[PDB]
């Protein structure tokens, strides 16, 4: 139907917007601590600690499959990155400190993306 196509064009435009947001969020991780999933070869117990792992490549795969219906779903995944890291790693580590910074720097980017999604419908 024509209704299904219009739905599809909106999903494609959301996807376009989220891709730019993702690139902006990932620039706030210049050390690439969150680029890829935590390695299970190198941290074999990781799943006993973290029940829902997340990373920027896994978010990128979901994105390009148009797997995000709205900004809320995308934000849940971003927040998992941060939140997983702050549980698994102690406060006086480079990893925890980098999550704190990605969180603080991301919130600006996310504050405006919420307005653009609401605005552009």
Swiss-Prot record:
Compartments, record wording: Nucleus; Chromosome
Expression across tissues: Highly expressed in testis.
Domain (Bromo) ranges: 9-113
Top-level lineage group: Eukaryota
Cross-link Glycyl lysine isopeptide (Lys-Gly) (interchain with G-Cter in SUMO2) placement: 41
Quaternary structure annotation from Swiss-Prot or TrEMBL: Component of some HBO1 complex composed of KAT7/HBO1, MEAF6, ING4 and BRD1/BRPF2. Component of the MOZ/MORF complex composed at least of ING5, KAT6A, KAT6B, MEAF6 and one of BRPF1, BRD1/BRPF2 and BRPF3. Interacts (via PHD-type zinc finger domain) with unmodified histone H3. Interacts (via PWWP domain) with dimethylated and trimethylated 'Lys-79' on histone H3.
Function (record text): Scaffold subunit of various histone acetyltransferase (HAT) complexes, such as the MOZ/MORF and HBO1 complexes, that acts as a regulator of hematopoiesis. Plays a key role in HBO1 complex by directing KAT7/HBO1 specificity towards histone H3 'Lys-14' acetylation (H3K14ac), thereby promoting erythroid differentiation.
Protein name in UniProt: Bromodomain-containing protein 1
Species of provenance: Homo sapiens
Stretch of the intact protein here: 555 to 674 of 1058
């Amino acid at each position: 139907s024509m209704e299904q196509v219009a739905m599809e064009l909106r999903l494609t435009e959301l996807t376009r917007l989220l891709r730019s947001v993702l690139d902006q969020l990932q620039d706030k991780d210049p050390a690439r601590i969150f680029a890829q999933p935590v390695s299970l070869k190198e941290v074999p117990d990781y799943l006993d600690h973290i029940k829902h792992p997340m990373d920027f490549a896994t978010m990128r795969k979901r994105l390009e499959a148009q797997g995000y219906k709205n900004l809320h779903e995308f934000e849940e995944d971003f927040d998992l990155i941060i939140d997983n890291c702050m549980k698994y790693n102690a406060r006086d580590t480079v990893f925890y400190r980098a999550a704190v910074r990605l969180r603080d720097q991301g919130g600006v980017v996310l504050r405006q993306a919420r307005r653009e999604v609401d605005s552009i419908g």
